[PDB]
């Protein structure tokens, strides 16, 4: 059979392969933490832009209503002028 | 000093402790891959909402433009009636 010294030499190869795998996993953890942080910045930026555009939506809807009031005003004035024209 | 069998046993304790740390790193990586996936899912969902919000904004800008031109035309038609009613 193999001597214990030979088995030790083979086991040290396993120890070194474990360390290399652990190095790769530690690097992957760091990269993933960075990806999470970057994606959180993206999501927060999207939420802030959504707030600004929701405010723009609000302002446009009210603008439509304001222009509808002006429309009614001008229509009523036009009818008043039309009635004056029936006495001209 | 220590026999090769005993040195093997000491090295095997290192193999086992490195395996524990490697398994813990793999679990951390899995948790971080879930965290990345959920944050990218959040960002994409916000982009979906943004696309529908921009559609609403575009439709409202169109309505504002249409109502504005209609009101400007009514203002011109009112001035025309006023000119027809002039006596001097």
Author numbering:
A (entry chain B), B (entry chain A): 569 to 656
Sentences from the paper on this structure:
Here we demonstrate that CEP85 is essential for faithful centriole duplication through a direct interaction with the previously uncharacterised N-terminal domain of STIL, a key factor involved in the early steps of centriole formation. Subsequently, through its C-terminal PB3, PLK4 interacts with STIL and phosphorylates it, enabling STIL to recruit SASS6 to the site of procentriole assembly.
Additional sidechain–sidechain hydrogen bonds and salt bridges act to further stabilize the dimer interface. As with the STIL NTD, we calculated the sequence conservation of the CEP85 coiled-coil (cc4) and mapped it onto its structure. This analysis showed the presence of a striking conservation on the outside of the coiled-coil towards its C-terminal end (within the dashed box) suggesting that this region might be involved in mediating protein–protein interactions. NMR and native, as well as cross-linking mass-spectrometry data support the notion of a direct interaction between the STIL NTD and the CEP85 cc4 domain. Further biophysical characterisations of the individual proteins in solution suggest that the STIL NTD is monomeric, while the CEP85 cc4 is in a monomer-dimer equilibrium at room temperature and at the concentrations and buffer conditions used in these biophysical studies while becoming predominantly dimeric at reduced temperatures. While we extend the spectrum of CEP85 activities by showing that its fourth coiled-coil domain interacts with STIL and thereby also plays a role in centriole duplication, the complexities of CEP85’s architecture suggest that it might have additional functions in vivo.
